[PDB]
């Protein structure tokens, strides 16, 4: 006999225009118009905008790599390798801070959450403006992107008694060792302007991590994690890693042959949001997130898809 079966079953708003302006065209306007992300969340947030102006000179005969990663409070990471090569296991990356890092994340590696507890990115841009004359320069500029994330790695240790360990690691760093098919390349004297975009279907809040100063951390070898290279941060009173947002990573390579003299000015932008602690001083500058606006998000996605990788500095 058959077995019985049961339990069978429109125009935009001002916040949207401000969001698009902060996302796509920072340097065109007199003052940054950014207000907030017009998502469903309408809690109490603190919005900050970071700009760094740094004058840099590239060594002749080397290749300089610059990473624009979504690490709060940090502008970029820099490393140098001989010309015609790529970073190796011996390469180390050092950071350059935005102004006022200690006034926000303290001077102790365990004080990172004394002021905020969550964040999320909204924009990230970078630009290079050469300053050398037209007789002493030589080289090129290449730009592409990589989807680097943060995960964990598990391995055993032969202690007494033996246990199993779990530490932090970065996955996706292998995209720096080769030039990507989607790239922008031109002469050095023309500069570059580029921007990134979100890599998740929705805007979410992350958490503030504690104790991270190096990756891999102390007493952990590079081979165990499987990373290509290291990411140092120096003294704990100067800088450190406090999180990792949902943004892509921009890598720039500047090649300078022997005899060249290249100088330029580097800029960086950041349109960010924070969750303030009630006992912090920054709480008084906060406000509420803008309400929902669908057309703004639709045009955000469309313009993010329709733009090229980068343009010359003349069309910044």
């Amino acid at each position: 006999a058959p077995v019985p079966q049961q339990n069978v079953p429109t125009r935009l708003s001002q916040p949207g225009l401000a969001f698009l302006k902060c996302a796509f065209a920072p340097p065109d306007f007199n003052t940054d118009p950014g207000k907030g992300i017009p998502d469903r969340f309408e809690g109490k947030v603190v919005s900050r905008k970071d700009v760094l102006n740094q004058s840099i000179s590239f060594t002749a005969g080397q290749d300089t790599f610059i990473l624009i990663a979504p690490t709060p409070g940090v502008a970029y990471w820099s490393a140098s390798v001989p010309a015609g090569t790529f970073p190796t296991s011996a390469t180390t990356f050092n950071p350059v801070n935005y102004p006022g890092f200690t006034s926000m994340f303290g001077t102790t590696s365990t004080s990172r959450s004394d002021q905020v507890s969550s964040f999320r990115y909204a924009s990230m841009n970078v630009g290079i403006y050469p300053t050398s004359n037209l007789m002493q320069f030589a080289g090129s500029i290449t730009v592409w992107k990589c989807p680097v994330k943060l995960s964990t790695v598990q391995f055993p240790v032969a202690t007494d008694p033996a246990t199993s360990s779990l530490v932090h690691t970065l996955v996706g760093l292998d995209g720096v060792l080769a030039v990507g098919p989607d790239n922008f390349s031109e002469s050095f004297i023309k500069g570059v302007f580029s921007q990134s975009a979100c890599n998740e279907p929705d805007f979410e809040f992350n958490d503030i991590l504690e104790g991270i100063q190096t990756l891999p951390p102390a007493n952990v070898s590079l081979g165990s994690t499987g990373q290509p290279f290291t990411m140092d941060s120096g003294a704990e009173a100067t800088s450190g890693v406090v999180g990792w947002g949902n943004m892509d990573t921009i890598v720039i390579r500047v090649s300078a042959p022997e005899g060249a003299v290249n100088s330029a000015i580097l800029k960086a932008w950041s349109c960010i949001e924070y969750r303030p602690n009630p006992n912090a001083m920054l709480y008084q500058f906060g406000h509420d997130s803008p309400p929902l606006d669908e057309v703004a998000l639709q045009e955000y996605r469309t313009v993010a898809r329709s733009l090229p990788v980068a343009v010359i500095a003349a069309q910044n």
Binding site: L20, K21, F24, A25, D28, E299, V303, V311, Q315, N316
Partner: peptide
């Protein structure tokens, strides 16, 4: 010469 590009893209998309 960048905001005009985004304006043109938006107008083309809406059209």
């Amino acid at each position: 010469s960048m905001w005009e590009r985004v304006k043109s893209i938006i107008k083309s998309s809406l059209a």
